[PDB]
């Protein structure tokens, strides 16, 4: 889904549209080192 998408993406703009956005955001910052591409 579009979390996953997000997450594959690693993009925090797109952890916006997912549900639970911090939790996109973590898992984010979990798949890509922060500060992101």
Same mark, same amino acid.
């Given at each position: 889904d %579009?979390?996953? =998408?997000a =997450? @594959?993406?690693?993009s925090?703009?797109?952890?916006?549209d /997912?549900?639970?956005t $911090? %939790?996109?955001?973590? @898992?984010?910052?979990?798949? /890509? *080192? $922060? *500060?992101?591409?």
């Amino acid at each position: 889904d %579009i979390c996953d =998408i997000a =997450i @594959a993406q690693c993009s925090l703009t797109l952890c916006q549209d /997912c549900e639970n956005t $911090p %939790i996109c955001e973590l @898992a984010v910052k979990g798949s /890509c *080192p $922060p *500060p992101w591409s």
